[PDB]
């Protein structure tokens, strides 16, 4: 079903450092989304280079990979109706001056470069990102959506 | 240092089910403890059996394994000074009738059998539980404590 | 006065089931609105049929009445300046994909059909709905607005 | 079953006045207890008198009725296992100087006389209070406990 | 730096009376702004007259000064990137019917005249207002921004 | 009246640092206590020395002054009935291992030395601390208690 849609959400090293892991997870929880993947990791540069490949050229890339490599990240896969579209809305617009109070970036980050959180911008982008961060065994299902989430 | 003590907290299937994961995590972060391991898994019978092996002959064993296997759980290693003893106080005492408001069990569970959460009861149980539930490459430490451990 | 305006808010069976009654009431409370009616009820089909009469024809009607009949609802009357207009804003837009973080539907529901909450869309609609759900004795006043709330 | 025990909680006029209704409700929901009765009323003298009838000869009787009548209150029946005993712990002990942070009185009231909230002290007081404050058609049960009661 | 920008925020007597001081401060805190001034005061009429000088003529002025004089105010100076622009956003639009859920006025005030909170609308206006409410000694710095905040 | 008792709470540099000021304030407001003094300052050595003068010969004196001076703190006078005794309960006992979840230390500090917060331990310490940290024109009272004090 469409209610088997999945999105990738990462909490970057400053989100963790500022003790926001509980608060962020809790927001998805009370929305009514289902957790299907959760993992705490030190991301390899390889992974980060691949993740940020579309920007492998721009000047900021090096320091950006460095930031993400610099601390633990929380990797998450959340499941539910329009979870990609709604998920971006819950995060707020990427720019931390356009982010409205009540969204995550809205209530919580100021710095545009070294922010708190990432979200998939499309269903395609999510599948790509879930592939990259998660092995298929680390995705637990029990929502009988696993048999529908094929592409 | 003594500030490198680690303890293991599990959120049992009901806790995940009831949507209490973030809340539970929030309490530990805001107390000041360091997250050094966090995963979402379906516990295997082989793991659950090894984990509860001191109870393997009690009559409720099979059903307790069946409970813990029945849904995904969240496993966690937290770090800090007296994090084991302190973590036991934050959950509240094992029996959710003796549990006090302000603790996790106090605020959140009613049933004694299927309850919300588990925490290590000793540094030794912690070492054992931790190694049982996490491969050592799964741990993430940056706190310059990893060496001490 | 205009500050004797009243609106009807219902928490539907899933709002109750998901343990959101405290959180929803508390939002009106801290806004500075006054509670003048609160009641926990199993709605009769008659009541629900009358409530949803404008849609007594559309296909979804039957299952919609069924949902509302299927569990306890919390009925509320809140009082205060522009409480109808502001009340809809606090709920968010009815569609759970347009609902912004920080509103009730925003933070809390995903499913468009079986949602969490209802609010009056007009002062007329409120009077109609308050009539329907509440007996005049179940409206407690102590805000000296009872003598002004005549239409 | 024992999981069909009901208890009565009232939020006295100050509690409503101070905007604490939702918060108070939130604590019971999140503990896991079932709401099976909830109304907003002006308590009558005739009801308040019958309710506090064990105190009808103490010197403060009249004024205590006058307090409870002076503003609308929120009445509630909650359901669950040990909900009476457990509900007493969540409010904190009757005297708001012995009350502990994390309990409702602890977090919210200062004055001993006019305080925030009332809870039943026994299954018997609960049955009595409940029937006194609610007609039985006012209760809403779906939890397949209604029969047990 | 631009990250030494400062804004003035006042909590008016009703914000205090309604016990909202913790909640308001906490919102700036979790945003990631730095407190550089905080003071609890009974404002002189002189101060208030000067503050509200641009409206020293309009009819509402007298009662408006009276309100602000009528109770304790909390005066605050917060520091950080775009703290003036972001600060207004965190407050919500000044009119309490346009204020969106999730902002401070949004979640918390209804009355347009006697509201909860004030925020600077510009960097100029902030400097003016900080001058007026704060002596330079009451501004504590420890963010090494004091040496940059010159105009 | 007895409802005019004042007590002094300081938030030490770590508390401000960790972003806990609002939260801490929220607890006192929501309990019902009146804010009658609130400032954000760098404490001087001369003040900190006078404040901790009963400890001036212990070996940790110098370093404790250095801690309290190392960053800005938030000073507060709160008003109400038993606000000193009650305020001590809300913080939790001085040693953050005996502290209970639901109290401020319980929920928020781990380290015993550098901790989050201070509260007066007696009406007399309160009077002394208050006058030490606040000039009397800095206090704001409207509660018709100012006279009583």
From Swiss-Prot, chains B, D, F:
InterPro entries: NDK-like_dom, NDK-like_dom_sf, Nucleoside_diP_kinase, Nucleoside_diP_kinase_AS. The active site is at 118 (pros-phosphohistidine intermediate). Its EC number is 2.7.4.6. Pfam families: NDK. One of its GO terms (biological process) is endocytosis. It is an enzyme of class 2 (transferase). Gene3D superfamilies: Nucleoside diphosphate kinase-like domain. Changing residue 118 to F: Loss of serine/threonine kinase activity. Some loss of motility of carcinoma cells. Changing residue 96 to S: Increased motility of carcinoma cells. Keywords: ATP-binding, Cytoplasm, Differentiation, Endocytosis, Isopeptide bond, Kinase, Magnesium, Metal-binding, Neurogenesis, Nucleotide metabolism, Nucleotide-binding, Nucleus, Phosphoprotein, Transferase, Ubl conjugation. It is found in: Cytoplasm; Nucleus. The modification Phosphoserine is found at residues 120, 122, 125. Autophosphorylation at His-118 increases serine/threonine protein kinase activity of the enzyme. Interaction with the SET complex inhibits the endonuclease activity. One of its GO terms (molecular function) is magnesium ion binding. Isoform 1 is expressed in heart, brain, placenta, lung, liver, skeletal muscle, pancreas, spleen and thymus. Expressed in lung carcinoma cell lines but not in normal lung tissues. Isoform 2 is ubiquitously expressed and its expression is also related to tumor differentiation. It catalyses: a 2'-deoxyribonucleoside 5'-diphosphate + ATP = a 2'-deoxyribonucleoside 5'-triphosphate + ADP; a ribonucleoside 5'-diphosphate + ATP = a ribonucleoside 5'-triphosphate + ADP. There is a cross-link at residue 100 (Glycyl lysine isopeptide (Lys-Gly) (interchain with G-Cter in ubiquitin)). The role of this protein in tumor development and progression is uncertain. This protein is found in reduced amount in some tumor cells of high metastatic potential. However, increased NME1 levels correlate with aggressive tumor features in neuroblastoma. May have distinct if not opposite roles in different tumors. Belongs to the NDK family. Major role in the synthesis of nucleoside triphosphates other than ATP. The ATP gamma phosphate is transferred to the NDP beta phosphate via a ping-pong mechanism, using a phosphorylated active-site intermediate. Possesses nucleoside-diphosphate kinase, serine/threonine-specific protein kinase, geranyl and farnesyl pyrophosphate kinase, histidine protein kinase and 3'-5' exonuclease activities. Involved in cell proliferation, differentiation and development, signal transduction, G protein-coupled receptor endocytosis, and gene expression. This is Nucleoside diphosphate kinase A. It comes from Homo sapiens. The lineage of its organism: Eukaryota, Metazoa, Chordata, Craniata, Vertebrata.
């Amino acid at each position: 079903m469409a209610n088997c849609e999945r999105t990738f959400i990462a909490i970057k090293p400053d989100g963790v450092q500022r003790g926001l892991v509980g608060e962020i997870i809790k927001r998805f929880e009370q929305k009514g989304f289902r957790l299907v993947g959760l993992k705490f990791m030190q991301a390899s540069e390889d992974l980060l280079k691949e993740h940020y490949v579309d920007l492998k050229d721009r000047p900021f890339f090096a320091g950006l990979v460095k930031y993400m490599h610099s601390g633990p990240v929380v990797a998450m896969v959340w499941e539910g109706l329009n979870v990609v579209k709604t998920g971006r809305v819950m995060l707020g617009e990427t720019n931390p001056a356009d982010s409205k109070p009540g969204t995550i970036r809205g209530d919580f980050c100021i710095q545009v470069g070294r922010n708190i959180i990432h979200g998939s911008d499309s269903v395609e982008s999510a599948e790509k990102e879930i592939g990259l961060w998660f092995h298929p065994e680390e995705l637990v299902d029990y929502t009988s959506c696993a048999q529908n989430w094929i592409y």
